[model samples]
Target: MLKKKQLTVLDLHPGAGKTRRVLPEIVREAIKKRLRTVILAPTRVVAAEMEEALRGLPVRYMTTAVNVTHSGTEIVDLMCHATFTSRLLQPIRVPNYNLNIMDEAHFTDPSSIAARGYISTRVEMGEAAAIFMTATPPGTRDAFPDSNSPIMDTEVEVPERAWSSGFDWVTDHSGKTVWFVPSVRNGNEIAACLTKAGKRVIQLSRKTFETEFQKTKNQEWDFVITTDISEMGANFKADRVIDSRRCLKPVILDGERVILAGPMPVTHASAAQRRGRIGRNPNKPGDEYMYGGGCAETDEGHAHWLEARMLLDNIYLQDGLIASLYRPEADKVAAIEGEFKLRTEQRKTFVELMKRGDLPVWLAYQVASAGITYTDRRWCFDGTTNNTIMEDSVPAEVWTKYGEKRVLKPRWMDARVCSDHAALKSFKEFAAGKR
Candidate 1:
């Protein structure tokens, strides 16, 4: 009977009482049944919110692997996604909990996928019940085949206008607005422009995130020029939203490049989450202004490409990698396998670069090894701060000499954080072009 029920996916709209009403009620009933319940949140911030809501209940909010021995008394475990997945690496026992409430289920990480697969196995065995909650939809719908997406008490908001250029809409609107930009640099520029035009503009990024977000609680700014960081957790009350353009991030898996660019390269779920930031107050109708062209097809294609990269890059790191692959949605399996084949074909370009003496020998080897196993010495595949410790040690001259085209710029190491011993050794050895 439990297997038949399988999974329940709450595909309710944002601010539709999914968190405010549904979660606490279900948690209370689970307490009544005295089941070992686990509420898995995608991030530490979200988990903290869940912790506040379930106050006075038999619940414990955890971010790290601790002794869950006391879980018998507590009954409910409010766990972060990272910790839940890390427990699997410990080769922990299966069916550890009877009920799982996976919040923001669409967000995918290699660790999260492995853990989800484990839960899916338990559901198949009729040992546990799972509830997958996500405000974002369309992408990852097939993640759990046995799951049913039930729409409950949702109100869809309609956008007012979509423009290709200019902020004429912002000039017209007197109400509070959120102008979403691609990056901090972009946000800063837009904020300056708006401020010069006599608009009350505050930039929201890493530097001013906390302070600016707190200010939004009481103060009203004409425009909150924000980076992609505000896409997920922050909820600013804005009558209008200006998605200036979809952001782009270069993803290279196993030395193969996949540029997430052009119109609507972002996932539908992500796009929805960004747009959903508006439409908070039901009394006042929310309006959205999209500056770029987009559609469901583009979002779906990009989502699959992104998922494919994630699975291929991190699958081998886990012991359950092989078994977990089979249990997930067939699309994910297909994406991983298909991405592997593409990598196999695309890797030849890197090999060709090596033959031409344009690519470093160590870099090519690292890419090659990633397909079969974890590379002994990890390489920073793209330009970003990945493997920052190793990248920090290498000079820009070395990257230029190797003709590694993907690295637009290299990041320097922070003075505060010490480099890992093994990473340091690997960095020097790899620099010497030794295997």
Candidate 2:
């Protein structure tokens, strides 16, 4: 979905063959219209899926690897260009394309692309527009596919599906079963739960996906658990996945109807995404055990802000926040980001700076506060006509501030730790990703 002037939102059920069913037509139609289309996925795995889906197709695409389109034919660029890349030495010129398709629209903000350099000055000037798609958009409400949007929208029935209590669902399944946790922090309890159940479990986190991936590669576990990580339908696939990642306000039960003492207003697109992500695998047909049932979000016992901050911070930083943000009492994040601090154009800019580069989240928040341009030396924004102002002052100043911040309080690599195993009696293995 794009904005000719207004935003175009495409809502979808995650695994219902929605994109496989819908996207080809849209991209091909854009091709038919000769509108240059660039697809940006929320994660690289998805961008790769887009490329693989269209491997033999005539569409030309390129990713953050930069330069040559994957097909090496049409001039169109690909999606999810890594914020930092040696390929980026020449930089990606996304705005030059005629049509832009953002695959995981829920995770993407159209204007933020400008700040990220995924788009350029031409994009800022409204030289191009996009299509936003997602099963679960952040911060609730959800994006429903509008008839007017070019990306299209859909829902597919999985037919009379019922699941065993979370335990049997994983135990009964021979193949890997994924339990989707909404926020990574909450994975601890679930993992400890499944681990204690006599199943050797592997909990996947963004930080340790690669290392843990290598460890769990040829071998699979009874439960391969994920939180927000599984939403994209990326590299991970399974016969069944239990989606505890999203919570219902009044709670959804029985079926699609919902308990509706309430519904979250904008029709829960995350449920739709869960459908897309969880269902019978192609290899295994007619399996009824697959269930992505709703659970009380991170904490069931009346913890509002805890759930919000954990999920929102992940949306902001794309990983767990470095601080101990858990709340036994008050919401710690309220002091810095509070309600008003988030979702404004300013927050958008901060997120843009993040998507464009690999800066740490805490530092990114600080730099956004510094009122500096977060672009490269060659790029410029509205207030400044040239890169000199953006590059020379604030960029260097903030980099220095980061250095000082780390000096005063170092980063994770150098965080203080105690090796006194005797205190705890034994060392419990913990990994951000096992890496």
Candidate 3:
């Protein structure tokens, strides 16, 4: 396909052989042409998995984002997007591979979006041909207008299922089950509850993934309680899957425990990836479930909006580094151009302010962070304390029309308090209500 087209998109579902079948063949053909290739996976685990799958091929897997240009003799390079972006950002190294394959292309993190921009720039400059393989494709037709988008393919047809909250639904299901929670604290809470209810459960977090992963082989567990660690290409078979929409992570404020919600909600693309973890075996059909009330429907628009801001910010930052090295019209990339149409009110406000020179580009970014939703100790605490930290990179400072300035510090909870603090109670109650 790289020989035929400049760009290609594979909008296939999970278990559709996009990775195991199509990708291996693509590498095989690229090897026949002796093309210098690079495969960009979303995470190291995913990249390592790909390296293992392509054992006999002339490939070298890279872990750090160092200058591999003068280091290796392999025709193909496999690396994580984080490492790729780090190299691109810093003056570490530049990859001039012939073929760039981005797996799980719907990933909208800051680094992932930046890597996409870099790839599109390379494609337009005739530096490389590219392939995008993702189960959930980002709406970017305006971005890559010339790329051929493949029809979504699936190996087995699974019924569309609704989101379900609480553990009542888990009681009715049997056989191996995987339950995905929002954070480590949430996982521990669910694991404790399930164990108290007389269910055999094995809990896993990012730190304990390898240690706990080995335990699942004996098949002694009924439910595997975990966070998003299992979501990205963790090969496990299960009869049922659960997605808890309560997106809260635990933070130790002084001595007390509190929870904080992230910038955005669970995206439709991410939800699809989570559900895709199941239904791998063609002979056995699987069930999909999600937390019902709180975050029932996935936020497709918000997800795009967040991606746009992150991409725009990345472009500005990258341009700064590039100018120092002395680059782009920035909007030339499809991923960014398509995002121009979906500018939300907050982004539009800042865009105009920057255009008119009323606000500095750096300040606009700080202000934009304020517009996005965030939770603090104010939700559960009475008075503030000294052991606090600012959530955003920029501090909370404001100026009036008369140039009068005020610093209303938006502090994150960090007080020398006991476990009975109001903030701790509020966090626990918040998680409890999700059940």
Candidate 4:
């Protein structure tokens, strides 16, 4: 099915439900071509959501790594999370598919161990034409333009919402309300206030939202409050919306998820999802009504920042009719690479060791995790001769729980053990044999 071993990126904005609608047609086309297909979603829930889009079409379920694809489940729609995709498909990376589609391609932060385990799989699969599609694609753009060559972009006219500063919009909309704020304390406080004012509001956190899914499905809620967790999959479709804006998402800076409100991690792709609530409901006229966030600091001086920020960033991302959404952290990718230098010998050893019979991708990943694990292991901010993190940095809880595995700089291990050249070569041979 793949005429060339290539990578393609499709950048789309939020308004058009192309992810749900157009994605299935691509699968249908791939099936028509008789090419084995696998679609990678960041979460299992996301995969299930995409599967719903391909409900009537043939779908496959191959859920094991270090083994062939499920005795014989056809790959009409090999929808799966990145977790298993790395393990099952990428471990040996046979000529299993003609096309491999990565849905949440923005999450493919190459330097991250979690991201690499899967992203590397797609990149390495020379047999398949890998297509990476994301609403907010990484800042590496000139590299992947939306119109020609390897990259293509699609966009639609998403109407702007007139955001009110106070809760006047909420009072105006009344029955149709869904607020997605970050802090649970803040979310609950707003929900409580709405409930006291005779509005039926259901507060949903990570835990409660799961239970409320059935109720949410039945359309039992008058108003709901949630967080960014609902940004991707959950659809409230309320006529009115009060969603959190301009969140400070955690990113790996050096060895830790550094920062209090570290560098505004603005992805224009997210802006659309946060504000796209009104379009979801049938009664809603799609983005015409006013939607606003409640003021936290006494509902007075605290102005909602998300309104203007979302609009401005949206304007920046899509130069014209909704093409490329600007990813704020595009330059950081190079910075991440510079800081985390992989040990060449260690990498060679890790790959070479796989010859000892095909290891599970998880196990390979675990060892590779060490190969690529971050060092500059913080001591007393001093030089370490022999003393390690296990002795000082590890917490009481860690010792109390997993028995202190002591994540360390892998530079200490030698030629005999893993990250060892001999073993890595062995594993490579084993990996090849399995193929």
Task: Write the candidate numbers in order of decreasing TM-score.
Answer: 1, 3, 4, 2
What TM-score does candidate 2 reach?
0.51
TM-score against truth, every candidate: 0.62, 0.51, 0.60, 0.54
Error of 2 at 241 (Å): 2.6
Expressed as tens digits, the lDDT of each residue in 82-178 for candidate 4 is: 3432343223543455677777665522211233222333445453476666655544322112211111112222112322244354655635666
What stretches of model 4 exceed 4 Å from their correct place?
1-3, 11-20, 62-71, 84-96, 104-127, 139-166, 203-211, 251-257, 260-266, 280-330, 334-435
> Candidate 2's residue-wise lDDT over 1-435, tens digit each?
433422345655445454676777776676667676666655555665677566555654445433333545564556563322223222233235566665665432222222222332224446666555555544444332221112212222211122325345455456665665544445666777667667777877655554564445577577676644444554444555555434323222231111213211122444444434434355545322333333222223222233233223323221322222312222312434332233344455556544553333333444454454554211111122221121123321112221221111111110011112221111011111110
Highest lDDT, which number? 3
Question: What lDDT does each candidate get?
Answer: 0.52, 0.41, 0.53, 0.42
The true-versus-predicted C-alpha distance at residue 110 of model 3, in Å, is 2.1
Query: What is the total number of backbone clashes in candidate 1?
Result: 0
Q: Return model 1's CA RMSD, one decimal.
A: 10.2
- Score candidate 1 by lDDT: 0.52
Which order, best to worst by lDDT? 3, 1, 4, 2
Judged by lDDT against the true structure, how good is candidate 4? 0.42
